[PDB]
Amino acid sequence: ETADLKSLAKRIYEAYLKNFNMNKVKARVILSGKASNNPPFVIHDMETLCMAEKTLVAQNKEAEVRIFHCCQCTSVETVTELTEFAKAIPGFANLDLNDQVTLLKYGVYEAIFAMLSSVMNKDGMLVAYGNGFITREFLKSLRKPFCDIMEPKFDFAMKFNALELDDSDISLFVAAIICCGDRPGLLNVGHIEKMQEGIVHVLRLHLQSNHPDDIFLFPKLLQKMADLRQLVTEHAQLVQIIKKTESDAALHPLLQEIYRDMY
Amino acid sequence: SLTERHKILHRLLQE
Ligand SMILES: COc1ccc(S(=O)(=O)n2cc(CCC(=O)O)c3cc(OC)ccc32)cc1
Numbered sequence: 001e002t003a004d005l006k007s008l009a010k011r012i013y014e015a016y017l018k019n020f021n022m023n024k025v026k027a028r029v030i031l032s033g034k035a036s037n038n039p040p041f042v043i044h045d046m047e048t049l050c051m052a053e054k055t056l057v058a059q060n061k062e063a064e065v066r067i068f069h070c071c072q073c074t075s076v077e078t079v080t081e082l083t084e085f086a087k088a089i090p091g092f093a094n095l096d097l098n099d100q101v102t103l104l105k106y107g108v109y110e111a112i113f114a115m116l117s118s119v120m121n122k123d124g125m126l127v128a129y130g131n132g133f134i135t136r137e138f139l140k141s142l143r144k145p146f147c148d149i150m151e152p153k154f155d156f157a158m159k160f161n162a163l164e165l166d167d168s169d170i171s172l173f174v175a176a177i178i179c180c181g182d183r184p185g186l187l188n189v190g191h192i193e194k195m196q197e198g199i200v201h202v203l204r205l206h207l208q209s210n211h212p213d214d215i216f217l218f219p220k221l222l223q224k225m226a227d228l229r230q231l232v233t234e235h236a237q238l239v240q241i242i243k244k245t246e247s248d249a250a251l252h253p254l255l256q257e258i259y260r261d262m263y
Numbered sequence: 264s265l266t267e268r269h270k271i272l273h274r275l276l277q278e
Contacts, residue, residue: 083275098265100276105269185265254271261268 001198004090008202009172015088016171019081022129024118024167030130031121040126040133052132064146065248067139072252074127078115079108079254086178091195096187103192105258107178109235110228114174117157125154145242149235156231160224163217169210172203173221177228233263 004011017023029035043049046063053066060066083104086092092100119126124135139150165173181193207217214220239259242249251259266273 080275083272087276097273097276101265101269101272104272104276257269257272 001091005198005202008090008198009168009206012089012175012199012202013168013171015085016167016174019085019088020078020115021081022119022126024165024170027119027126027130030126031119040131043127043132043134044138049138052128055128061248064142065246067142068146068242068249070127072255075112076252076254078112079104079258082108082111082174082178085174089175089179089195089199091191092179095191098185099187099192102183102185103178103180105262106183106232107180108258109232110225111174111177113153113156113228113231113235114160114177114224115170116153117160118170120154120157120161122154122158125150145238145246149238152231152234156227163214163220163224164211166210169206172199172206173224175199176203177225236263 030040033039041048041052043052049063049067059069086100086104086107092103095103116125119130122136124133124138126132127134136151136154140147176196176199179192179195179199181189181196186192203221204218207214207221211217236259239251243251243259
């Protein structure tokens with residue numbers, strides 16, 4: 001394995017490109033309307049929401065619950081993609097299957113929030129594969145609890161985006177997020193922490209070639225990782241609240257088992 | 264156990 005370090009960065013990156021439909025370089029041209037005369041449809045109020053829903057699946061309750069369910073769809077799609085992505089990290093499939101699951105369990109949402117930043121700016125975010133753009137303010141204007149779910153993610157994304165990472169950076173970051181040695185219930189820690197060490201080692205080298213001026217970019221990234229942990233724990237608890245006191249808020253089974261006893 | 268309390272996930276893990 002000391003051998004596969006040399007192309008480890010390149011390896012992780014192209015797993016990222018292979019496995020994630022939407023990426024930062026794609027989101028960024030869309031959000032900058034430079035490739036196109038035809039911007040995403042803007043969902044900024046209840047009416048424009050209803051307009052977009054007309055595209056249908058191509059149920060049906062209150063507006064928040066409708067938005068809620070649609071997010072789960074993207075979440076499921078991303079968890080799945082991350083699953084494939086992790087299998088591609090050298091030594092991940094060689095791990096105890098009960099460890100392959102706890103790594104994903106605790107890591108998916110951290111990585112999801114990290115990758116979300118790519119489709120976000122201070123005013124909103126791309127949805128439906130970049131065809132839509134739902135505003136931050138609209139989401140905030142939602143009611144009681146639902147208006148509280150996305151906002152902290154915007155807050156994180158704005159600071160994370162100021163680091164100006166590219167996908168080759170982000171892929172490694174996500175890889176490191178995933179191979180975390182201190183997750184609960186991990187069987188053979190040592191092997192994993194060894195995995196961690198190698199990824200962090202190529203990450204740091206990569207940051208130094210890629211962002212030579214940003215001397216402490218790597219420590220900055222370490223703190224982002226801590227921040228993401230806190231973010232995910234908080235999100236986990238909000239989603240539980242909503243799971244308790246919201247009848248129509250059904251949770252897709254794959255996500256049911258992820259939150260199920262996390263934080 | 265985990266492999267049990269994480270059915271779908273587990274199934275994804277294996278090919
Ligand atoms: C468009 O892709 C995504 C992917 C993820 C997220 S998220 O912030 O994590 N997020 C997740 C849920 C439901 C639970 C789950 O999906 O796990 C949710 C509900 C909301 O109510 C208005 C707002 C944001 C939400 C947003 C967009």
